């Protein structure tokens, strides 16, 4: 997977045939095909080094945020759109906290951060890290902050301190874990690189625009370290989307080895509500690790919801559990509706019935998360299959009066389903939207 021109353009163009090939242009053909190796031609040096590295490497590199089951993976992406292919690694969420704050307020805020995990749609949303920033006067307040937070929380960390000396002294007692080193700058990158080198921690790279970022990255990479996250220095959301796209584009569409690393985004919106919406634009536009300031459950829920949806494989359908779902009151005198486990189908029905206002039982038959008609065609939805799901519930005992409602779209099944299940099958409306009419009648 390497263009013959890209190979030839790097060649000395001597046409000596010491490679065993009449010309370089023909040797470039043999390299793209694989007839001969590139180590044969004794000519050139740095040309052969970059070629092998570029040909056999992903566009976006992978840098892990620490070790253990708590560690998360960032970067490693090959797409600009989710429909072309699935997005692999979800956005890393990190809540920021200052060091000049009091200990009682510090612990109270950290304690609240550990509770930023939600349960919805049979799914579990969680955050990843905590950002400890240095705003105090004394450099000893920062080390007293990171060690304090690391004693309360068990999540990942990301250290934010300009002076490496202040950072290292605060890093030493936590260097064995994750803590990302934010950030390297064109004035203090040397010391910052050495800290992340010996301690084997990821190193954040700051830059003023695309240019300064690219120049600084190459220098840090040349020092031997390749575990980096990128920061174009974008503080405005419009400037962010543009810059965040370039890193994703140039690395994938141009193999830019300076932007072949994930992106760390910083929220700047003063208002917590505006920050959440600004975070949505980031988690959508190729940002890997975003740093929030607001830590409210009211705010983190819509963000973590969109993050989950965007990073779902378009191939695999969203599915709910194959277990009787009680709607409203129930009480043993309620309608039983048969449907499939596809999340989209299930909630279409769940939504319609909550609307109905009559407590209902909803049995989402396990069709591997397929919409009943599709499952139907598969034959996954069968009278034998639905009948068997009735039993697992052992529902007939559960309901005093026996009946079940079938989606109108598979109306055909009702005789066969009725006869082997022993349950009176009513064929409902083809669309769950008419469930209310059925309830009325």
């Amino acid at each position: 997977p390497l263009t013959g021109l890209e190979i030839y353009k790097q060649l000395p163009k001597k046409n000596c045939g010491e490679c065993g090939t009449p010309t370089c242009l023909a040797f470039a053909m043999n390299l793209a095909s694989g007839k001969a190796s590139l180590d044969s031609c004794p000519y050139v040096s740095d040309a052969a080094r970059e070629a092998l590295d570029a040909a056999a490497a992903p566009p976006i590199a992978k840098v892990v945020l620490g070790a253990g089951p708590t560690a998360v993976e960032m970067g490693d992406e090959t797409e600009l759109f989710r429909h072309d292919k699935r997005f692999y690694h979800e956005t890393a969420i990190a809540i920021q906290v200052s060091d000049n704050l009091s200990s009682e307020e510090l612990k109270a805020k950290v304690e609240a951060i550990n509770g930023l995990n939600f349960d919805r749609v049979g799914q579990h949303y969680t955050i990843q890290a905590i950002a400890i920033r240095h705003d105090a006067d004394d450099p000893a307040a920062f080390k007293a902050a990171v060690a304090s937070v690391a004693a309360a929380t068990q999540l990942n960390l990301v250290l934010m301190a300009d002076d490496p000396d202040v950072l290292k002294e605060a890093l030493a007692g936590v260097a064995d874990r994750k803590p990302l080193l934010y950030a390297a700058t064109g004035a203090n990158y040397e010391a910052m690189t050495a800290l992340a080198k010996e301690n084997n921690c990821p190193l954040a790279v700051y830059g003023n625009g695309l240019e300064e970022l690219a120049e600084l990255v190459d220098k840090i990479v040349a020092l031997g370290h390749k575990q980096l996250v990128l920061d174009p220095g974008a503080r405005e959301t419009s400037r962010a989307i543009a810059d965040f796209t370039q890193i994703r584009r140039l690395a994938i569409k141009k193999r830019f080895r300076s932007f072949g690393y994930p992106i760390i985004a910083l929220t700047t919106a003063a208002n917590p509500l505006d920050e959440v919406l600004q975070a949505v634009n980031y988690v959508t536009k190729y940002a890997s690790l975003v740093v929030l300031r607001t830590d409210a459950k009211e705010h983190l829920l819509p963000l973590l919801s969109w993050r989950q949806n965007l990073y779902t494989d378009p191939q695999v359908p969203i599915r709910v559990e194959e277990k009787l779902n009680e709607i409203g009151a129930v009480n043993e005198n309620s309608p039983v509706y048969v449907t499939t486990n596809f999340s989209l189908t299930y909630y279409s029905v769940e939504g319609e019935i909550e609307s109905t206002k009559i407590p209902s039982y909803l049995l989402s038959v396990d069709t591997d998360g397929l919409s009943v008609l599709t499952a139907y065609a598969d034959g996954k939805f069968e009278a034998e299959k639905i009948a068997a799901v009735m039993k697992k519930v052992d529902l007939d005992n559960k309901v005093k009066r026996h009946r079940i409602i079938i989606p109108g779209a598979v109306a055909v099944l009702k005789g066969k389903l009725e006869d082997l299940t022993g349950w009176e099958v009513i064929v409902g409306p083809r669309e769950a939207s008419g469930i209310v009419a059925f309830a009325r009648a």
């Binding site: 072309d84 292919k85 699935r86 494989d313 378009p314 191939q315 695999v316 591997d368 069968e382």
Partner: protein
């Protein structure tokens, strides 16, 4: 190109009713109508409609080879049903189909070598159909490694990259071609391939136009077999013409007729 007739499937109205009442007449007719079309192989599927598969599969095998000698292709997921059909097969056989999962591999792979039949292998897993061709190749490579494992000739291995309708899943069609194109290069001797051609035009306007078009495109990428409608004269012509354009069969002015009377 090996055209495998698809008409004998339990999803059709006549075939379904011919199983419940056990009527050999419609089954035998389609076994002859597809042969006249140009199909040198017949696909036997009992369908979801029939209650028992063991009895239904064995019933199809007998009545099909009663008036035909074409290479029969057993189409089912049930392991017992497949082996049940292989018993009454007096002619050559072809198991359809299997996936890369070991639970399916350990059971069907030696079953194909035992009767010395062909094995259609799907490039899918338990989760579902892969998107990228790289994953289709991954499941294909495993089918090749499992082919050299159980001792099965590669020319009997029919890789199935699977094909989805060009309306709901249009983005799969170019991936299937990329799959087929790279299938021949991942192994030498190269494994054969087979597609459910009629699936690409499901719920699509002008189905035959889409069917034969994708066939030519698939053969250009290296397609050996194809499970489609043999009663479609326009489809047979394209299948015949593609052989000439691939230099598989020596050209003659009546190249269409010779493929139909192979």
């Amino acid at each position: 190109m090996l055209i495998i007739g698809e008409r004998i499937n339990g999803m059709f109205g006549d075939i379904k009713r011919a199983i419940q009442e056990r009527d050999p007449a419609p089954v035998q007719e389609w076994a002859r109508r597809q042969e006249e079309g140009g199909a040198r192989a017949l696909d036997l599927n009992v369908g979801p409609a029939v209650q028992d598969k063991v009895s239904a599969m064995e019933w199809l095998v007998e009545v099909t080879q009663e008036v035909s000698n074409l290479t029969l292709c057993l189409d089912s997921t049930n392991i017992k049903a497949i082996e049940a059909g292989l018993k009454k097969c007096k002619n050559r056989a072809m198991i359809n189909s299997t996936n890369a999962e070991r639970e399916k591999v350990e059971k069907l792979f030696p079953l194909a070598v035992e009767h010395g039949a062909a094995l259609i292998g799907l490039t899918m897993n338990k989760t579902g159909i892969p998107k990228d061709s790289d994953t289709r190749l991954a499941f294909a490579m495993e089918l090749v490694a499992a082919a050299d494992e159980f001792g099965l000739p590669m020319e009997d291995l029919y890789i199935d990259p699977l094909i989805l309708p060009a309306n709901v899943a249009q983005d799969h069609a170019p991936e299937v071609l990329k799959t087929l194109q790279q299938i021949k290069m991942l192994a030498d001797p190269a494994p054969k391939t087979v597609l459910g051609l009629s699936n690409v035009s499901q719920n699509c306007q002008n189905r035959p136009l889409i069917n034969r078009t994708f066939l030519a495109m698939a053969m250009a990428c290296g397609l050996d077999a194809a499970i489609a409608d043999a009663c479609d004269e326009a489809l047979i012509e394209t299948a015949a013409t593609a052989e000439i354009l691939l230099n598989q069969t020596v050209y003659c002015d009546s190249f269409v007729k010779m493929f139909k009377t192979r």
